[PDB]
Structure formats: C-alpha cells, structure tokens
Design a protein around this ligand. Structure first.
Ligand SMILES: [Zn+2]
Lengths: 239, 119, 37, 186, 99, 251, 51, 49
DNA sequence: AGCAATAAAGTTTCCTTCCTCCTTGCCGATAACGAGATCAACTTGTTTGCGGCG
DNA sequence: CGCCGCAAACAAGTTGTAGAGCTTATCGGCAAGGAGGAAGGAAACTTTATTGCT
C-alpha cells in the first residue's frame, strides 16, 4: 500500500519488509499448541497486519527502537488470534496458570502429590473456589464420531440418549381431558365457561375477562375451585 | 443381453457420425426413420460389447449409478448436463420408497403409468 | 408430497439467495455456560 | 435391477439352436433337459420328415421330450432370450417356464434378480500322439480338405476338420479333433 | 431380545440396535433382493416407511391397529431429503419435477 | 439452511481434480497451468491490447515485467479466479461449435476426432442444459442447519459436536480478515496469502485430503468433510437408506 | 399383571396369524420363509428339521 | 505420567483380562501378535504370513 | 342455599436501584536469540485411464 | 505410434465386547461499559376465611 507521501511509503514498506524475518523468528517457537500452531500462516498474516498498525503510529521522539515499539503489537495480534479461537474466559485461564505454577512449585517443595488441603492453603482463598474451578477449567470438549474401540463396532453417535422425547398418549389424554373440561363446565356459569375455555383452549388471556366483567375476580376464584371439585368426581391415571 | 445395450454408429444423418449409443435407440430411430419417414437419412451400425461394471455406470439413470460406486463422478457428469431420471427401476422406487414397477404393485404402477400418459 | 420425477441442475447464486433466509457473520455458536444459542 | 417381463408374447422372430454338450465323452446335458419348457423357434419336425408339432411355439414339457426322444432328433431352435425384441422388457414365451412353479410365466416378473442370486449362492462352495476309437460306429468328417497320403490313408489338408464317431443310427457317440495332415489309419 | 416400539435415532429418527438400548433389528439389501424375487411390493413399502422412518406413518398405523384397523398410508422418508439437503450444500440445484 | 456472502470468487473441485475436468477440458488448457494460476504463482494474459501477445498466454511475474515495462497499458494479465471468470464469461459457444464441426471434416484422425467430439458435446451440454459456465465460480454458498451438524452436552456438561462447524469458522475468520485488510488498501502479498488460505479452507470443507494434505484435529485424524456423508458403505445409500433398523422385530 | 385372560386372548389372536423368519446371510430367496405360529414354553424356537 | 497412563489405558495391546477360567488367563497372557505399532494389518496382510 | 363484607395472607410483578461484578475493546517501553521438518507411514493390489513420452 | 509412469480406487454380512483422555500452553493493565443481581421492599393483585342478609 501507500500514503499521501511516497518516500514515507517506500521507507515504510522497506522497514515493513525488513522485519518480516522478525515476524518469523519470534513466531517460530510459538509452536506445538492448538492446530493453528501447526499452520503458521495465520500467524504471518496477523503479524503483518499488526506491523502495519504499529507502523502507522511509530513514535519517534521517544527514541525507542521501532522493532521495540513493534514487538508489542506483534504479540498482541498473535495472542488476539489465539483468543479468537478459544471461547472460554480469560481470568479462568489466569487461575489455571496459577494452579499450574503453584501446584508444581509446591509439589517440588514437598516431593509428592495430591494433598489438596495444601492447595487450600497456598491458594488460601477458599476450598469451594477451586472446587468449582476444577469443573470450570479442567474439562474440555470432545467430538462425536469417535469409533468405539475394538475395531470400529460402532461410534458414539449410536450410544446416545435423550430426555425430551415424544410420547403419544399423554397429548391424547390431555386433549381428552380438554373436552372433559368443557364437558364438566358446560353446566356452570356463562362467562367462566368462556373464561376457562378460551384461556385453556386457544391459549389466550385470563384476566382479560376479569377486566371484561369488572367484579374483582373473586367469583372467578370460588367458581374455579368448584370446577376443580367437579373434576375431582372421576378417575384418571398418568399420575 | 444386458451386457449388450449399445452400438457404435457407422453412417450419419440423424445424429453424430460414430457417437457411442444404445443399439436399442438405434433400432428405434431406424424403426421410425428408415421407414417411410425416409428411405435413409439415419445411419447404420456396428454392435458393441461392454463389461458389466462400467455398463452399470454407463446408464440413463444416474441414481443407481450414484448408489454404490464412483457416485461423485456420475454426479458431476450428469449435473453438468441437466439430466433427469424417470423412476422406472426398482432401486429408484425403493430409495424414494414408492411401489415397485413390478410384482404385486405392477398393476398400480401401470395405473400410474397410464396416469402419466393420462396427465 | 406426491411428485413425478427428479431433476438436477446448477446452483445459480440467486438461487442461493432465494433459498437462504439470512446471512451469517461470526464463528461462534453459543455461550460456554448458558447452554444457549 | 432393471429387468422384468413386460409383455405376454413379443411375436418376435427366431433365435438360437440347441445341440447337445456330449463332447469328450457321453451326454452331459440331455437335449431333453435343455428343451424342458423352452418355446420353439418355429414349426419343427421328425426324422421321418414333415411332422409339425408346434405352430412356432409350445410349452415343451416332458410329454414332448418323451414324444421326441422316441425319435432321434438332435437339434432345435428357440425364440431365445437374446432374440426377443421388446423395448424395455421381454416376452414370457422366449423365457419358457418357471422352474420353481412348473408352468408358463405370467407377465410381471423379475428375472436377472433370480439369475444373479442363483449363480452367486453356489459360488461360495465352488472353488472348493494318437486318436483311438473305443467302440463301433459310422465316421463323419465335415468341412474337410484332405488327401490320400502316399501310404494310401487319409491326411488332412485343412485345419477345419475334426473326427467323429457317429453311431450306426446317425447320432454322435464321440468327437475328437485331428491335426492338419495327421496320419490316419482309415 | 424382542422389541415392539420405543426409542429412536435423532439425526435420522429410525431405531437403534442393541438389547442394552432396546434395539431394533436390521433389514439388509439381501432381504430386499429376495423379496423382489418374489415381488411383494407392499411389504417393502411398510418395511421402509413405517417401521423405519415415516413418523406420521408409525403414528397413524399404531392408531389404526388399536382401533382394529389393519390398513396403510405412506409418506416420504425424511432420510431422503437429508441427502437433498446435503447435495444443495455442496453447491447444486438438485430439485424435483412435480407431477 | 442459510448462507454466506464471499468477498471474492472461488472455484469448485469436483469440477476440477476429478477425471476429465470440464473446466479447462472446455478451454483447451491443461491443469498445471491452471493450478499455477489459482495457487497464485503466475500471471496470465486476459486480453492483449497488443496482438504482440496472445490470449491464454502464461506470464511468470519476471517475464511479465518485461511486457509490463515495455507497454504497461496495452495488455491485461492477472492471476486468479476473477481472471478465469471473465475469461469463461468472454467466450461464445456457437462459433466454436461450428468451427469444430467444420474442421472436424478435414482430418478426423481418431484421437483428434475424439477430442473434437468431446468438446463439441460439452458445448451442446452448456447450451441445452440452459446452464452458464459463469456459474462454475463460487461467490456465495449455503449454511447447513444445526440439526445436521449439531452440538449437544454430556452427563458431566461436556460436549460433542460436528467438525463441519470448525471448517466454517476458519473460512469466516479469513474472509473477515480480508475485509478488514481491504479497508486499508494494504500491500498485496498478504492479500494473496489471504486468498490462498481462503480457497484452501473452502475445498477442504468440501473434501479434505484430495488436493492438499488433510486437516486434522489434535488426534492427528481428519476433520471429516461432507462427501463421506454420501460415500463408501458409510454413506446414506449403503448404511442408512437401503439398509434399515426395524421395530416390531426380534430374534 | 399377566392374568389368565391375557393368555386366552393371546390364543384367540395368534391363530391364523403368520410370521416371517430370517437366517443370515440371505443368499437366495429361500433364506427367509413364512410360517404359522405355535406358542411354546421356553425362550428358544423350535424349527421343522427339513429346512 | 501422561504417556505412561496413556498406553497403560490407550494402547490396542492393553486389555482387560479374561477372568472366566484359569486357562483363559494364563493363555491370554501367553498370547502373541504382530499387530499394533511396528506391525501389520488384516486387510493388507495376506496368506503368506 | 346464593350473595357480599371485612380482614388477613400471600403473592407475582416489576421495577427500580445501588451495590458489585463482569466482560468488550484498546494500547505499551531496556536488547536479541532462528526459515519449519519432529514424530508419523509402511509400501495392499490389480485394473484401468490419461499424460506424457518417445 | 506404443510404451511408461502415474494415479485411482473397490475390497461379505449382522450380532455383540467396554470404557476415553490430551504434548500442550496461550499479556496484562485500563476503562467504560453494559448487563446482571441482589437487596429488601411496595404494591397490584390476588386469594382465604370469618361473619353478615335474601
Ligand atoms: Zn419376447
């Protein structure tokens, strides 16, 4: 690219160009981690753009190096991309790093393992805090089609269960009970008939009717009780 | 007789000169064209043979072809060409799950065929 | 439900337009906890 | 997948001859067995000539195989599968009989289905000088160019020819081909 | 093990296999080929629609049986159109000619 | 389903890496030239304002410069899908059909006659299908619904997912990057890399380890594409569609 | 609760109520057949020897 | 510890044992293969081995 | 038995509200280390097509 | 023309057999915010129960 000025474009670009090797060799050990670590091209693109941004706003009267001003923005772009893919919070991972440092530090202090009361000590905030944190951090996602082990008998997609299933007779008898409701109340007062019909049938408004009559909905109350007393005159399982 | 459902062309005037083609359609055109339709513009023929595995590939329908082997390639070469299968085989009906063009459901299938003929 | 035949064709862009309902713009699915879209 | 019977008879023209598979030794498929339930290509006759028994087509059941094995026929044609002309399908006549049923096929059946499974099922199981007459009979050599050799006997001057032992009646007992200019004793 | 009616898959809604998970049995192509050798269409219609995928089908047939009614109605498998939806995903105007 | 708009076009692979292309098979150009375009190695003539130079004429970015500094204006030569796009866009079918059928008559030697036929029926296909070679590109694509690539939780809150999603994501990231970049008019090289990575992401979505070597997770195992929803035994045909699990059954 | 009437009506239904049988693998079309039930007291099927 | 835990828990070699009868165990530990890493495969390998 | 009143009790709303927390974006201060590979695959195999490849 | 090289691509069926992880290691402060959050409570509003009159 370029600017309004041209010499401050070619000097710009030459500098930009000269410390692409910079982009590289600082990046070349920010390896083994998440598979974009394997990619390395994302890193280069990111580094170039962060470079441009640093370039745009070099501050020269400070007398810092421009590589020194640059490195910050470089790392910023790197870490930004890395934060982009992960979808878990940050202070989470702070605490994770902290337990890592601490638990190793103290495991060498001691020379043996797994006495969590020490974790409660050295990280003396509370037990429940880490006790939650271990949930929060130490559990990552997995995939769906991993084969089931002792050659490919089936996947994980065949060993799955659900709780929100369909069931055919509950709705059946619910509708049965709906016409039983109208059957019960058809001998009872005209508005409450329509109240409970149109609220329970087509899933409309209740106190919309209390506003229509303007009686305070007390007569509603006892009559509703009576409808219950009227439906407690028969038998039905599904309890 | 299913190994042999193709013949290459000798003459021309109906279609391309030597384009590989159904013997059966060749018989059709000449049973239509070389008749009083015309003495001859249509063409004569060699007679072709084809091993089974690609004969099955080399078919009108893409679907059965698309079912078992090298479906992708089928799909490309068909889809470029705005092709269309007509639900006459078995697999064609079992996949969509319609009644068979034969057996018990032969009768309703011929009914549906004359319906296709009758709108 | 009842239909005659199959046909394959090419996917013109405006067919993508007509078929679609809205344009997606970002990589996420959900919250990491509120098990929500 | 595609194949069925479409039509009852295609009214179509001729097809192939069957003559037996006796070669090397004795019969290995009776002409009867081959015929059984075929349909004739044409009106057919008897060694005492001119005795039609199909008007171009019949169910060739064991009555006929018997009726005809009484006599000495050795060759007949049939409206083969291959010669049926029906567009998208076949006739039942060309096919003959349903073995499992025992009669003429009614229209509407699938075929190559049966073919493929019927041949695939056993296939599991199924990987697992001089010429010297033995018995008397007439000799029959056809399509020969040959010569009385210097000795006085016969030697072949055309690779076409092959020896037969034909019985005294006229049906073949044996057949063994003889090389070009091979030395004969007869 | 036996099984009348129970759980299903989710992506394709046809039943599972395994006595542990109340499993339905499998019906292979070979069994199709044999049936075609006989030529009994309606069997297959049922075998593939109602006892496998057609959910409307399974429902209304259950309804009819308990009503004493031993009759049929077909639909279309979901599993079909899935493929269609895969196809268009791949950038293709797959479609169908209405009657 | 839904969709995504793309910044720039890309091209399809079942149209390309498969046996006979239909893409340059049409053009009369080889594969290798075309990769070196679309992998962004070599420029190529669009349309020489000077007939000094030629259509379909390949330009390395060093010899390109000779022609450039000599003339500058009076040629058009680029590298990528847009180039091939306007190229496909340019050509008429009709005349090519007639001239092929014409000069076929001259020397219909068998391999030659074959190839003439080959192209000619391609042409008739493009005509009579109603299709457009314009539409061989890809600038817009669809978004398959969650239900078919879902993500659901486990007993201990853990998750299980479809890799498809993962591939969609990279695509989107790169495209968004590219827009962000384009807003700044940045130097071109990072743009080039951006679109290399673009098309690579794209076709790897379609079919992973075919053109370039495959993408995997941490396990060292592939990020399974579409095509194997349809293929081998595993596909709908041989697994799900022809063979059936069944109720009202036992043993 | 498995009352005796349950078994009575079972006997009532299953007469004339045929079923389908399958061994694996299906080579030829006789690999399956169509039989008629007879209820028995076990958890294993009896089978007519000749098939 | 991760690797150690792994193939003591992840390898195709490490299996449950067959606690059914003495023979079962003692044989199952006297059992030999040429599979797994640095070995072979069923469909590729043929008859000669 | 039908109808209302007073009093009490529990609310659902619901709305603010001010504490506290939590998350989305940015920009910064010493100087220079090296072009990756990294932990794998074991070569099935016969048939068939097509690009060379003369 | 007739090699040669190279690359592609299929490899029985249905049962079951038990359980899954991670080589990892990924600023760091500020701000402003915007959502949430909880408090304890006010308050329509609603709901019960106990005596009055047709
Ligand atoms: Zn016929």
């Amino acid at each position: 690219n370029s600017l309004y000025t041209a010499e401050g474009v070619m000097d710009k670009h030459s500098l930009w160009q000269r410390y692409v090797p910079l982009v590289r060799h600082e990046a070349l050990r920010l390896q083994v981690r998440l598979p974009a670590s394997v990619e390395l091209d994302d890193l280069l693109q990111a580094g170039g753009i962060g470079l441009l941004n640093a370039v745009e706003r070099y501050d020269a009267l400070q007398g810092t190096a421009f590589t020194t001003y640059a490195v910050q923005r470089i790392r910023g772009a790197m870490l930004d991309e890395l934060r982009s893919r992960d979808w878990v919070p940050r202070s989470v991972r702070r605490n994770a790093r902290e337990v890592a440092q601490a638990i190793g530090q103290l495991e060498q202090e001691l020379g043996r393992n797994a006495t969590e009361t020490e974790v409660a000590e050295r990280l003396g905030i509370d037990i429940a805090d880490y006790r939650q944190m271990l949930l929060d951090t130490n559990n990552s996602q997995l995939f769906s089609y991993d084969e089931w082990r002792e050659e490919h008998g089936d996947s994980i997609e065949l060993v799955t269960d659900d709780h929100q299933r369909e069931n055919p007779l509950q709705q059946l008898l619910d509708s049965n009970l709906r016409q039983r409701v109208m059957e019960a109340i058809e001998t009872l007062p005209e508005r409450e008939k329509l109240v409970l019909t149109l609220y329970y049938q087509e899933e409309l408004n209740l106190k919309e009717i209390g506003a229509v009559l303007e009686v305070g909905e007390s007569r509603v109350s006892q009559l509703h009780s009576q409808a219950i007393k009227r439906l407690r005159t028969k038998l039905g399982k599904l309890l | 007789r299913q190994m042999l459902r193709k013949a290459t062309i000798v003459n021309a005037g109906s279609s391309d000169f030597l384009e590989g083609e159904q013997v059966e359609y060749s018989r059709v055109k000449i049973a239509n064209r070389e008749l009083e339709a015309n003495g001859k513009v249509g063409a004569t023929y060699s007679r072709d043979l084809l091993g089974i595995t690609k004969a099955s590939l080399a078919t009108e329908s893409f679907i059965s072809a698309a079912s078992f082997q090298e479906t992708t390639r089928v799909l490309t070469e068909a889809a470029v060409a705005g092709k269309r299968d007509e639900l006459r085989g078995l697999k064609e009906n079992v996949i969509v799950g319609r009644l068979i063009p034969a057996g018990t459901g032969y009768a309703y299938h011929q009914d549906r065929m004359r319906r296709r003929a009758a709108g | 439900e009842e239909f005659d035949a199959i046909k394959i064709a090419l996917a013109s862009p405006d067919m993508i337009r007509s078929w679609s309902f809205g344009e997606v713009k970002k990589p996420e699915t959900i919250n990491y906890r509120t098990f929500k879209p | 997948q595609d194949l069925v019977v479409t039509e009852d008879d295609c009214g179509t023209h001729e097809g192939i001859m069957m003559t037996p598979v006796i070669e090397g030794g004795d019969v290995k498929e009776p002409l009867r067995d081959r015929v059984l339930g075929r349909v004739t290509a044409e009106d057919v006759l008897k060694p005492g000539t001119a005795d039609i028994l199909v008007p171009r087509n019949t169910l060739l059941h064991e009555q006929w195989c018997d009726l005809l094995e009484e006599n000495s026929v050795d060759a007949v044609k049939v409206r083969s599968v291959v010669s049926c002309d029906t567009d998208f399908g076949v006739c039942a006549h060309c096919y003959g009989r349903d073995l499992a049923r025992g009669h003429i096929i009614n229209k509407g059946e699938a075929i190559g289905v049966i073919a493929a499974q019927s041949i695939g099922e056993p296939g599991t199981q199924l990987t697992m000088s001089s010429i010297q007459v033995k018995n008397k009979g007439s000799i029959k050599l056809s399509n020969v160019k040959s010569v009385v050799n210097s000795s006085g006997k016969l030697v072949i001057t055309s690779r076409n020819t092959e020896l037969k032992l034909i019985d005294e009646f006229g049906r073949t007992k044996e057949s063994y081909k003889v090389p070009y200019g091979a030395v004969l004793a007869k | 093990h036996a099984r009348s009616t129970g759980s299903y898959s989710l992506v394709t809604q046809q039943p599972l296999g395994g006595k542990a998970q109340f499993g339905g049995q499998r019906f292979g192509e070979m069994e199709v080929w044999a049936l075609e050798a006989y030529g009994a269409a309606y069997t297959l219609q049922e075998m593939l629609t109602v006892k496998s995928d057609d959910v409307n089908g399974r429902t209304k047939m259950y309804k009819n049986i308990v009503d004493g009614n031993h009759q049929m109605e077909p639909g279309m498998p979901e599993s079909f159109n899935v493929l269609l939806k895969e196809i268009r995903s791949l950038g293709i105007n797959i479609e169908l000619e209405d009657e | 389903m839904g969709h995504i708009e793309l910044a720039s076009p890309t091209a399809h692979i079942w149209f390309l890496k498969s046996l006979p292309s239909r893409i340059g098979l049409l053009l009369d150009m080889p594969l290798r030239d075309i990769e070196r375009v679309l992998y962004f190695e070599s420029y190529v003539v669009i349309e020489g304002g000077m007939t000094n130079l030629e259509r379909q004429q390949i330009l390395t970015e060093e010899q390109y410069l000779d022609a450039l500094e000599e003339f500058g204006d009076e040629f058009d030569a680029k590298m990528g899908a847009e180039a091939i796009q306007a190229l496909l866009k340019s050509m008429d079918l009709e005349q090519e059909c007639e001239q092929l059928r014409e000069e076929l008559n001259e020397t219909n030697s068998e391999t030659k006659r074959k190839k003439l036929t080959k192209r000619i029926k391609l042409l008739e296909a493009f005509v009579q299908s109603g299709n457009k070679p314009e539409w061989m590109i890809l600038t817009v694509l669809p978004v398959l619904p969650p239900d078919l690539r879902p993500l659901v939780p486990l007993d201990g809150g853990r998750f299980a997912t479809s890799d498809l999603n993962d591939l969609y994501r990279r695509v989107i990231n790169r495209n968004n990057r590219l827009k962000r970049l384009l807003d700044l008019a940045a130097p071109d090289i990072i743009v080039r890399n951006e679109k290399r990575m673009l098309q690579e992401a794209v076709d790897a979505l379609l079919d992973n380890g075919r053109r370039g070597r495959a993408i995997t997770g941490s396990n060292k195992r592939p990020l399974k594409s579409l095509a194997d929803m349809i293929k081998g035994k595993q596909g709908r045909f041989r697994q799900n569609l022809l063979g059936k699990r069944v109720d009202y059954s036992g043993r | 609760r498995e009352e005796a009437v349950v078994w009575d009506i079972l006997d009532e239904v299953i007469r004339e109520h045929p079923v389908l049988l399958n061994r694996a693998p299906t080579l030829h079309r006789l690999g399956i057949q169509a039989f008629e039930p007879v209820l028995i007291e076990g958890k294993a099927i009896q089978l007519h020897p000749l098939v | 510890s991760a690797a150690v835990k792994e193939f003591f828990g992840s390898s195709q070699l490490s299996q449950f044992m067959d606690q059914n009868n003495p023979l079962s165990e003692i044989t199952h530990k006297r059992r030999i293969s040429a599979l797994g890493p640095g070995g072979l495969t069923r469909e590729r390998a043929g008859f000669e081995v």
